[PDB]
């Protein structure tokens, strides 16, 4: 019995103000391109609750591979942040007229777009 930890209890502090995530989309960096490499990054921060989904699009068409996303983590300001990225070849990045990052957060939807 002694020193054994009981299963815990998760506490959630209710009535916290909700915040739609700010979405900042970044195109492949110059250093990246000069090394024949390309990565798109969709940064989402200051949102609460910390639950959301992202859909990447190429020319308006949803994607289904090369997509990853860091786990939402609570920041000092008590709101969350996270980022999703899409790895492409330099030829893929220049083959399309546009790429999009569509973030859905509790009945809100915000989509940003970038182009070569």
């Amino acid at each position: 019995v002694t020193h054994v930890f009981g299963s815990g209890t998760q506490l959630t502090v209710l009535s916290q103000p909700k915040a739609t995530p700010s979405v900042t989309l970044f195109p492949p960096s110059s250093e990246e391109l000069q090394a024949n490499k390309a990565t798109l990054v969709c940064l989402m921060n200051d949102f609460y609750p910390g639950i959301l989904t992202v859909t990447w699009k190429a020319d308006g068409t949803p994607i289904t591979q090369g997509v990853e996303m860091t786990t939402p983590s609570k920041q000092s300001n008590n709101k969350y942040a996270a980022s999703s990225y899409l790895s492409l070849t330099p030829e893929q990045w220049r083959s399309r007229r546009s790429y999009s990052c569509q973030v859905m957060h509790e009945g809100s939807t915000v989509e940003k777009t970038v182009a070569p």
Binding site: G6, S7, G8, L11, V13, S73
Partner: protein
Amino acid sequence: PVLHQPPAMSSALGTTIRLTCTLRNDHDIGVYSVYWYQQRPGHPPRFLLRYFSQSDKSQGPQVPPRFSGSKDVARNRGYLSISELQPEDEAMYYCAMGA
């Protein structure tokens, strides 16, 4: 299941809430001190307090008085109370026995 703790609990900001740690029947909580620990996602467990009685207890380093323990010997329960709830308080809370 020696120690039992309700998986989840909630209350509003700036409010006071009380958690319950129940010991298993086949054990007298009257001979044990109750230890409470807080652990936020990404962090190590943090010792909050130790409580045997109103006359025998200890507070964790840098831990605010808004966190207070107690118990119900009859019911074999261990209590943790948190006053003026704030966002940061969102975390896992574990209890443990000992002396």
